[PDB]
Symmetry: C3
Subunit: 281 residues, 3 copies
Amino acid sequence: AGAAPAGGEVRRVTLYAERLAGGQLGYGLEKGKASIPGPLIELNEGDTLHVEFENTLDVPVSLHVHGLDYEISSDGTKQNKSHVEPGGTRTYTWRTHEPGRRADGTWRAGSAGYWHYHDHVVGTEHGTGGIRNGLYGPVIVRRKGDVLPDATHTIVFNDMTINNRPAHTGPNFEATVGDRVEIVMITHGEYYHTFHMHGHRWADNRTGMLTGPDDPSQVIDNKICGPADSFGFQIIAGEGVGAGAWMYHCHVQSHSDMGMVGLFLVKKPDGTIPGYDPQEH
Amino acid sequence: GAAPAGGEVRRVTLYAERLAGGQLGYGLEKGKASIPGPLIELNEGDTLHVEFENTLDVPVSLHVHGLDYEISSDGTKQNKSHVEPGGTRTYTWRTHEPGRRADGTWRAGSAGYWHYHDHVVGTEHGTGGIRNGLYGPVIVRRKGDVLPDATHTIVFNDMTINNRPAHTGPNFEATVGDRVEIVMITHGEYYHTFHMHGHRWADNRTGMLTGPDDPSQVIDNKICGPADSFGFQIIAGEGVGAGAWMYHCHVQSHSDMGMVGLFLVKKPDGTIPGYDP
Amino acid sequence: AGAAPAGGEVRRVTLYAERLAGGQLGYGLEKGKASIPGPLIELNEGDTLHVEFENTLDVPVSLHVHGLDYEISSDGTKQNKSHVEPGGTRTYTWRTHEPGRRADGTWRAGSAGYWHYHDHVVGTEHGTGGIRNGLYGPVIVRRKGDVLPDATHTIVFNDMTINNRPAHTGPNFEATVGDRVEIVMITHGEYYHTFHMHGHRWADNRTGMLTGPDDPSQVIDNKICGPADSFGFQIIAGEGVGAGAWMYHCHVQSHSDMGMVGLFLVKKPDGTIPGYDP
Ligand SMILES: [Cu+2]
Ligand SMILES: [Cu+2]
Ligand SMILES: [Cu+2]
Ligand SMILES: [Cu+2]
Ligand SMILES: [Cu+2]
Ligand SMILES: [Cu+2]
Ligand SMILES: [Cu+2]
Ligand SMILES: [Cu+2]
Ligand SMILES: [Cu+2]
């Protein structure tokens, strides 16, 4: 368990929007390495990120982010002329801030949390065609002293798919018992969902962990979520429950029946998962 | 500045009337009904007697979330507190401060972002009333709560915002640095997700973190369903500047079909950069 | 009526899946006595429960629980070979733990909460047919020092029904002004809902009560919920509002109109309910 540092760096990254195989659309850090979800962008509170965005598609595309600070010119919307023409580039600037006491004595909430970025202009002026086809990704903004995980996995319920995968194709993720595993969970599209994990639970607060015995946050294993909700958490793999093929699914019953399921495959230290037979899943 | 302790007995006249295009609304005076209805504001301890007159050709009622009331003011047919056409009735709403009970447990106060609506037009759950515009906000403040420079009410009623036509806002104006309060209420049949560009708030009572030990989540996108009510204050343009900041339901077809408005945050000189209407 | 003690007991119960009238299915503490929702199970953090389960149905059934600790062999899924053949029995073991600091120094959340159990194999391998027909029930896990209620009532929004009852049949629940009344609220199926109570409000946190003036938890009377969500709370009946037939309902408008409504009948001490006639 590492700790996030205080932020304040100016960082740059290149991002591209590209057609994938099978007619999907994705963001990536380098040409031909686009993915759904898009790449995970990580920052510490006070960091600034300059996203040099290139649009390789034949229609306008944009980049809009939740949670973080930006000026209207990096809104990523047609309304504010912040979309990128076919073949074009544009640098979007995202800023983040620490919490702190205002002059009026109130508390400014910081930028930290589990956030996301997505297209705002493909298909419609709300990015509906862009989101449908894969133009979304995760952003984590860490607070000084936050617990850092061994692994981070992103699970996007996009309409009736997980990460735009075909029905009943996961994804699955692997850990060893004792691993500190971070989930980022984002929802998109038209439908509400409930995200559930067998054998694991978390706090419904920013970090998904109680800060201590005086934290009143709720502890849950089932979370309602709708389009553009983003939350996250860290769990200790197999804590109190051990190894196995631990299902996660949307708990709306027809949704689980129609493919919104995957596996958190928690292994013993020797690499084994007793009983696990993929033919039975 | 800050809300005082409450404990005044307040009285107000409210009327239900027909508005243009067959809508129905609450107002403080005859001819002044609005959708949403007028904002009622109280401090915990306060009492409010609402002298309600029904000018419609159908029974109408007044039902309130969150506040204390006796059965004879629940605004239902069940407890005979609906108002016949042409009739009058006084509804009594009370509110209380928090404090410790004798068993050691803490009684929560009335404070919050609440709402009132009809419970008898169309059905005995007010379905047709609510659909037609018979709803409005009620804020109950706790002693010491920060007061805003302005309050705006946003209601997602089925696929409309404030019963308005698709893609007609409302828009709400503020100047950079203003302390702006939003009351956000949901009604009808559908779930929604309320999102604002450029701004975020805490998912707790006041929408602001009480300080560095407040573990309330900070969000920009909030799932809501029928009769949910929440609120928050944000500093307009804080860390982001002036501009036309969209807010919208984030369910995709809803935003596409017109559940979208603008939070127009002005520079001090009153202009809005980049804002081509 | 008291406070929860610290747990750490090994307990056992017997539970049966059986048919009920009309093709409903339920769990029961004894054969013949299945109910929908199933029997309330209550534990104190640290307790272990061995559930000695029998399937009296003609199709496989299972028992799966939210929140509690269980090893993979007690998953209650076909996928991990934890289901029960027709006429079969199996012991499912559920454990619970206290909050405390982990080895890595962070705070481990305890098992306490308002949880639930349900079938995961009837109709589909997510229990869709089981849940639909009534194979679900409440579990409460208490934290040492939690205040205990005078009564506990469970309300489940299962698709468009409450507790799989016919439309417009409540249920109704009775108390006396001043009673400490505990509500367990579970949702299943296909629909989101908003649970609303006239005359009463509760905190959107574990217990439904604020810890004290420093507890930032929201105070609400209207709670969005979806399939497999579970929350609970304790209210003082008629507190600041008095006696009467206090309505509770889903606030999604067509749902209340189509019969997801009941009454919280709060009696005066003489046992009467002002303004209410059957
Ligand atoms: Cu947007
Ligand atoms: Cu789903
Ligand atoms: Cu968005
Ligand atoms: Cu009602
Ligand atoms: Cu919507
Ligand atoms: Cu209501
Ligand atoms: Cu499951
Ligand atoms: Cu409902
Ligand atoms: Cu479940």
